[PDB]
Amino acid sequence: PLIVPYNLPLPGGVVPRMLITILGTVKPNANRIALDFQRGNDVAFHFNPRFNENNRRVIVCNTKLDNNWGREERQSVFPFESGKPFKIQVLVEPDHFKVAVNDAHLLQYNHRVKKLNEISKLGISGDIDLTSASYTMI
Numbered sequence: 769p770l771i772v773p774y775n776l777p778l779p780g781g782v783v784p785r786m787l788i789t790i791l792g793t794v795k796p797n798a799n800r801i802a803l804d805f806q807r808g809n810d811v812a813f814h815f816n817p818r819f820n821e822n823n824r825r826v827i828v829c830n831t832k833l834d835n836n837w838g839r840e841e842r843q844s845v846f847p848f849e850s851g852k853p854f855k856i857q858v859l860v861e862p863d864h865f866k867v868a869v870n871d872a873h874l875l876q877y878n879h880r881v882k883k884l885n886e887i888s889k890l891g892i893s894g895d896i897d898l899t900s901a902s903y904t905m906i
């Protein structure tokens with residue numbers, strides 16, 4: 769049981785074949801969740817489930833540079849359900865982050881920030897009860 773918002777240090781940044789696992793439970797009337805993989809103040813990879821944007825559920829992903837959001841990447845495949853236990857796995861690959869939820873592939877996001885070994889924090893926020901956050905090499 770971890771207090772949200774939660775900061776997970778990623779020592780020496782990320783690297784291909786590093787797997788980051790987030791476990792928790794979605795709150796009963798959730799509206800939003802966010803994962804923010806940060807390089808200093810920049811956000812290399814923002815992963816943002818939205819449960820009610822114009823009465824649709826959507827995943828929004830983006831990058832923040834010098835305090836400005838860039839081009840959003842959107843999709844309607846949406847695996848989360850309010851009130852349920854979830855697992856998000858983010859696997860760093862050479863050209864992209866890959867995300868799987870509850871053991872089903874969800875999306876990939878190409879690397880816009882290229883200094884991977886400087887992406888040294890993961891922020892976890894929004895409408896969840898967070899159980900644990902950790903990493904391993906596969």
Ligand SMILES: OC[C@H]1O[C@@H](S[C@@H]2O[C@H](CO)[C@@H](O)[C@H](O)[C@H]2O)[C@H](O)[C@@H](n2cc(Sc3ccccc3)nn2)[C@H]1O
Pocket residue numbers: 800801802814816828829830837838840893894
């Ligand atoms: O681009 C990614 C960002 O998008 C904006 S919303 C964006 O705003 C633009 C300008 O008005 C419109 O042009 C676009 O159409 C529209 O999508 C979101 O507010 C950004 N966010 C999401 C979250 S979660 C969260 C929020 C509070 C507390 C905990 C977790 N925290 N920050 C980010 O997701």
